[PDB]
Design a protein. Structure first.
Length: 249
């Protein structure tokens, strides 16, 4: 399975929030979320093939392929009576969106979609990595903020991490549509989140998601940098819960 549980539901709550990680993300990046349950829904994290319990798989290079795997898994494993919330940050927002598209089309009625810190699908990220050589690729990763300069000094760490990171970044950068009219807008209620000082996704880049979403609130600004979902977890979960009161009741 791609999904790993982080929180069980508590206090009689029936909702299930499924989080799609950013490029290069893995379970260790979300350990702070396990330190403390911040809302009563069940919470699961999606694992990209190639790491964690899925180390034996080759990493995928397509957002829509990842979304197909996830949508099939959720259709098989989530009761139609469970209020399902799909969330994603950066690359994960693209997967969450495409997963929501498949589930909505199949008649499965996700209760909410949370798009965080990601440019819209008819745009490109202002920072691009896939065309760069290893040293320049790593410098960009370090600048983003989730990578140690120790990676540069160990060719074995580079030989392990670069195939994974390059697969993820190729997937997220090659994901692009010429215009929002390539498919119908999604009707699942949606929340857009961005970071006050997120250097990777400006307010304008996130706001452009309104081209793709018929029932949408935001952007709602969380004070923080690109890693606000983790570093400002309390604010992140507060905004999710506040905006989907139906799902949490």
């Amino acid at each position: 399975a791609m999904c790993i549980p982080l929180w069980p539901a508590r206090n009689g709550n029936t909702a299930h929030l499924v989080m799609c990680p950013f490029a290069g993300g893995s379970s260790s990046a979300f350990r702070h979320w396990q330190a403390e349950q911040l809302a009563d829904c069940a919470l699961s994290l999606v694992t990209w093939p190639g790491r964690d319990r899925l180390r034996h798989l080759e990493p995928l290079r397509s957002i829509t392929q990842l979304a197909a795997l996830l949508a099939n898994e959720l259709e098989a494993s989530v009761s139609p009576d469970t209020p399902l919330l799909l969330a994603g940050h950066a690359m994960g927002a693209q997967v969450a969106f495409e997963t929501c598209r498949l589930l909505e089309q199949r008649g499965l009625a996700p209760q909410g979609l949370i798009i965080s810190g990601c440019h819209a699908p008819h745009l490109h990220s202002e920072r691009q990595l896939s065309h760069r050589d290893d040293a320049d690729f790593i410098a960009e990763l370090i600048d983003i903020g989730g990578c140690s300069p120790e990676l540069r000094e160990n060719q074995e760490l580079m030989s392990l991490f670069l195939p994974l990171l390059r697969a993820d970044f190729y997937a997220t950068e090659s994901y692009h549509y010429d215009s929002p009219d390539v498919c119908p807008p999604l009707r699942t209620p949606a929340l857009l989140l961005c970071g006050s000082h997120d250097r990777e996704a400006s307010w304008q880049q996130v706001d452009a998601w309104r081209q793709w979403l018929s029932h949408v609130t935001g952007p709602v600004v969380i004070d923080g940098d690109h890693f606000y979902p983790i570093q400002q977890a309390r604010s992140f979960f507060t905004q999710i819960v506040r905006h989907f009161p139906h799902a949490f009741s």
